[PDB]
């Protein structure tokens, strides 16, 4: 039962007027718990999960101070990158940063991450050993040189292996009622005739948490990918997820097909077969 805490930051420059749009969201596994939107009125880090509201004023004041500091760094970064890439001041660009840590089943630090993207492509990322950097190009290389000299990795590693994990464990405890609860997918199959000779069997997995899930179709006991379609896992909007996989089969032969659902919330995978 591994867990993770991740913070996602997106800054978009707006050359026409004003500062970059900055949006930060924090997540524990697949549950968002905080957010900061430079466009919002509060100008404060805000709760997005009931269990984080428990935190006192100092928490919110500190997260706000830190997230505002983050937005300013991104603001500067947008300018720095514009220069490194010799880009015009008139265009809008995007800097993204994601970082966080994972704790393993033993509840101890498993891994940390801290990566950055510029205009949707890898820019620089801390490697798994949390001691070296992966720079995608020469702009990133310059950042890498500066970060190595400033020993940024060491500082990050301390947060990722210490603070990050400590708070992740704190949130997990505080919101254990949901965070440490798996919601097994509620499954069912629907049948839709597409012609007189063919039908579509759609296997639904609903209201599950976490988002990770596998739906596979088998025909007579062997996996079938042809004649199938599986939509990307999507949020139901109430904190759970949905997904479905479908297969077109010869009408009358529905019994040969089985839908297999694997999910952390299921002791053993579920197998569905049309009525």
């Amino acid at each position: 039962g591994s867990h993770s805490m991740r913070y996602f930051f997106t800054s978009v420059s707006r050359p026409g007027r004003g500062e970059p749009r900055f949006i930060a969201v924090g997540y524990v596994d697949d549950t968002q718990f905080v957010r900061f939107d430079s466009d919002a009125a509060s100008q404060r880090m805000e709760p997005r999960a009931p269990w984080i509201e428990q935190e006192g004023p100092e928490y919110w004041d500190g997260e706000t101070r830190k997230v505002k500091a983050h937005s300013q760094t991104h603001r500067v970064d947008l300018g720095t990158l514009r220069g490194y890439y010799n880009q015009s001041e008139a265009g809008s660009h995007t800097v993204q940063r994601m970082y966080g840590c994972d704790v393993g089943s033993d509840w101890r630090f498993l891994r940390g991450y801290h990566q950055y993207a510029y205009d949707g492509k890898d820019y620089i990322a801390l490697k798994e050993d949390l001691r070296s950097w992966t720079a995608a190009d020469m702009a990133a290389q310059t950042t890498k040189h500066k970060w190595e000299a400033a020993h940024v990795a060491e500082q990050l590693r301390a947060y990722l292996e210490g603070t990050c994990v400590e708070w992740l464990r704190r949130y997990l405890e505080n919101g254990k009622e949901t965070l440490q609860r798996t919601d097994a997918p509620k499954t069912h199959m629907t049948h839709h005739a597409v012609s007189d000779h063919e039908a579509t069997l759609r296997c639904w997995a609903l209201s599950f948490y976490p988002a990770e899930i596998t739906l596979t179709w088998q025909r007579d006991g062997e996996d079938q990918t042809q004649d199938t379609e599986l939509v990307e896992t999507r949020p139901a909007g109430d904190g759970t997820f949905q997904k479905w996989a479908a297969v077109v089969v010869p009408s009358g032969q529905e019994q040969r097909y089985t839908c297999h659902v694997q999910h952390e919330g299921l002791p053993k995978p579920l197998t569905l077969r049309w009525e």
Partner: peptide, 9 residues
């Protein structure tokens, strides 16, 4: 909890 210091690119 967010990281404290963020180094510029």
């Amino acid at each position: 909890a967010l990281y404290n210091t963020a180094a510029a690119l």
